[PDB]
Structure formats: C-alpha cells, structure tokens
Design a protein around this ligand. Structure first.
Ligand code: 69F
Ligand code: NA
Ligand code: ZN
Ligand code: ZN
Ligand code: ZN
Length: 226
C-alpha cells in the first residue's frame, strides 16, 4: 500500500485470540485439535503421507503469542488449514470429521466482527456456493452445485446424463479417451477473491467492497482510507 497498515503483534493477539478461545471452549469438539498431531502415538502412521503441513490450536496460539502473523488473513488461513487437513484425512462418518465441522461452524460465526474491528470487510474465506459449471455436450447445459459430473484436466466438464473436445469453433478438436475422465461432485468452494486497498494495503473481498455502480479508475481505496 501507499500508506501501509502495519499490524503490531499485540493488536493481532488481542483481536484474534477470542476467536481461538471460542474454538478451545468447544467440548468435546476441540479435543482432537488442541495439540499437534502425533501419528505414532495415535496409531495413524500414514498421516503425513496425506497431510503435508499439519496445523493445530496450540500452534496457532503460539504463533499469535510470538507475533508470527503479519496480517490477520494469515491467521484465518491457518485455522482453515487445520480444518481442511482434518476433513481430508478423516472419513465423513468419523468423530474427528464431525467435530471439525462443529469447530468450523463456530469459527464462521465469530470471525466477521473481529476482522471488521481490524478494518476488513469480513472474515469469510470461502465463496458461499460452488460455481456453476458449463456442460460441453449441449449448448444450454450447465452443472449446478452439488451435481455429479465427469471432468478431464479440470476443464472439459460433462453432466453425467449426456456423458470430441474443443473450446472454440476455430480450435481443431481432439479425441480424448472416454475413460480418461474423472467422476466428481460439484461441491467445492473456492476462496473469495481479493482486491487490495491501494492506501493501507489491506486485502478486501471484491464481492464485499466493489459495487456494480462504482468505478475505481485510480485503484480501489477502502472506506477507512477515503
Ligand atoms: C486431528 C487429529 C488427527 C486426525 O486428523 N485424525 C485423528 C485420528 C485419530 C485420533 C485423533 C485424535 C487426536 C487427539 C485426540 C482425539 O480425541 C478423540 C476423542 C475421543 C473421545 C472424546 C473426545 C475426543 C482424537 C485424530 N485427530
Ligand atoms: Na475425508
Ligand atoms: Zn469480505
Ligand atoms: Zn449436459
Ligand atoms: Zn485502506
């Protein structure tokens, strides 16, 4: 930013620690998350084959306590890294998975006013809904949220009912092997994209701060920097 906002460690600790404490308070649901994952002790020796960057409540607290975050979205990212690790490693029917989901529900209810007190639009990391996908074999056809579909290379998509590829009428089409696709479900949420305030440098969501009737020819400036 031009007049950059610098967060001092105590500012971040005092603002964000209540949201971490809200997770700690959940009993039984925080219990799997209060300490670093110890695969030999827990009997899950394949853990680090699947989880490459572990995260837990005690580590996040230590990072807040020692000023290891420069800005609060780094804290939000660590909280969701912790959650996403657990949703990846554990089965949907498992205790740890269900406890993770409770913690995420608590976090999402706590984080917005805290991030707003630090000058941000909100604290919400992910978009509200999966994006609607375009379906290749009809013109009209689209893949709604949570629908099943097939996909090659994350790009050419087909709804399973109508399941020779090209992305432009002038592009020579190629024959791809049906049985080289991957069946998927359209239930993934992407991170909400950001725009930086050109004065203070805070990352704000495009959807929160950019409006259909406003132009920013010299660059976005947030409400507090105006
Ligand atoms: C996050 C971490 C690692 C993980 O992804 N999966 C996992 C698998 C097996 C046990 C635990 C585990 C670790 C510590 C405590 C714990 O407690 C479970 C429990 C049992 C009974 C009451 C309350 C909590 C489970 C666990 N969790
Ligand atoms: Na899983
Ligand atoms: Zn926002
Ligand atoms: Zn279709
Ligand atoms: Zn600003």
């Amino acid at each position: 930013g031009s007049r950059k906002k610098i967060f001092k460690p105590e500012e971040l600790r005092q603002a964000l620690m209540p949201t971490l404490e809200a997770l700690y308070r959940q009993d039984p649901e925080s219990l799997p998350f209060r300490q670093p994952v110890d695969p030999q002790l827990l009997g899950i020796p394949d853990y680090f084959d699947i989880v490459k960057n572990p995260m837990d409540l005690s580590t996040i607290k230590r990072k807040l306590d020692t000023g290891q975050y420069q800005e609060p979205w780094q804290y939000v990212d660590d909280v969701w890294l912790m959650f996403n690790n657990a949703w990846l490693y554990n089965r949907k029917t498992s205790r740890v998975y269900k406890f993770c989901s409770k913690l995420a529900e608590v976090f999402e209810q706590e984080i917005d006013p805290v991030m707003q007190s630090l000058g941000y639009c909100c604290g919400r990391k992910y978009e509200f809904s999966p994006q609607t996908l375009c379906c290749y074999g009809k013109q009209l056809c689209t893949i709604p949220r949570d629908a099943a579909y097939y996909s090659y290379q994350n790009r050419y998509h087909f709804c399973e009912k109508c399941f020779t590829l090209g992305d432009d009428p002038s592009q020579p089409q190629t024959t791809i092997s049906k049985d080289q696709f991957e069946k998927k479900k359209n239930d993934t949420l992407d991170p909400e994209p950001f725009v930086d305030c050109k004065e203070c440098g805070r990352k704000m969501h495009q959807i929160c701060v950019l409006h259909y009737d406003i132009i920013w020819p010299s660059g976005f400036v947030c409400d507090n920097c105006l």
